Paper text:
In addition, the p85α BH domain, either alone or together with the SH3 domain, can bind to and positively regulate PTEN activity.
To determine if the patient-derived p85α BH domain mutations impacted the overall folded structure of the BH domain, several of these BH domain mutants were crystalized and their structures were determined using X-ray crystallography. In contrast, several of the p85α mutants (E137K, K288Q, E297K) showed near wild type binding to PTEN, and either had enhanced (K288Q) or reduced (E297K, E137K) ability to stimulate PTEN lipid phosphatase activity. Three BH domain mutants, I177N, E217K and E297K, all showed significantly increased Rab5-GAP activity, whereas the E137K mutant had reduced activity. The location of cancer patient-derived p85α BH mutations with significant impacts on Rab5 binding (I177, E217) and/or regulation (E137, I177, E217, E297) are shown in the modeled p85α BH domain: Rab5 complex. These mutation sites are located in regions of the p85α BH domain, well away from the Rab5 binding pocket. Further, crystal structure determinations for several of these mutant BH domains indicated that no major structural alterations were present.
Residue numbers in the entry:
A (entry chain B): 113 to 167, 172 to 276, 280 to 298
B (entry chain A): 113 to 167, 172 to 297
The structure:
Amino acid sequence: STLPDLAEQFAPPDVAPPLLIKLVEAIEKKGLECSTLYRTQSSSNPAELRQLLDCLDLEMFDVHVLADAFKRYLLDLPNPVIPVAVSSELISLAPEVQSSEEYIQLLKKLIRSPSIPHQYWLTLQYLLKHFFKLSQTSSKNLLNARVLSELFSPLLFRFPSENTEHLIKIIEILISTKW
Amino acid sequence: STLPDLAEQFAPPDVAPPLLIKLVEAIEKKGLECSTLYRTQSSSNPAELRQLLDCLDLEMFDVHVLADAFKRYLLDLPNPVIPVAVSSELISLAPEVQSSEEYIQLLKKLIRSPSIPHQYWLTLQYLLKHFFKLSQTSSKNLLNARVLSELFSPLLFRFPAASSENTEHLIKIIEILISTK
């Protein structure tokens, strides 16, 4: 797993990692209406998926393989899209705080911190955009904000339990549109 | 004060921040043989030098202003070229580690850590290349590797520490890495 840090894959004024852009655009072109996108295990193992993530047109690949490589990408990032410091703070507030809008405002504040490269917020924004576009064809792909949140929150925060429930809902709301 | 983090100013495959490249290339074009480069102050204050670090061709400026803007840039980076995490560990090393080669090995390992974006090490390498290029015209600019280390180590590490055998070691490694490029 040689995948560089998000901050090493691109920098402003670019808006997202170029590899993540290729994956998202190919997946959206080929699987926007696939009733099982992101919920089916393809036949490829991590080593094969990583070969795809190390270099040519991703549209040539099976859409279920692209979906698995997307997940592999989020898993292999040296640091998760939502850094551990941010997740740790949100989780330790879990019993004391229960306002979703407060969690959302705090997540935004924490992830835009000066100590955290801007690329993390930018990538999160790009992923939320992708997840939201999928939810607009939910009647066909069955991926609504809630399902998308349950699938990807563990990859974005990098957790496998009851504390997590607050994090999942945050993503669900942010997918559906919010601050 | 508004200078973005090194990790936000560029990313691979670029090798250094574009602004730093402009400064270095202009300084090398106009001052490679200047015998007081980096050793005299220009008349501009920090606010004016920061003004320059936004926006034109930098070759248009007085070379002594460019040299001061170069220093201003290193000082205004939100985190120094050599992050404090690295400096703290290096300064903490015991006297039994008397080997410059060991300090260098640890600097590379610590600064290449996944917790530190590759841009910091890349920027340091670009600066060392510049410092090495200067030391090769020492017969005219009077700049050797050691003096360049003594001048710029406080800007690269940005570390208030009392002079010790640890501080001497960090200056020494920078000296070695300049002459080794």
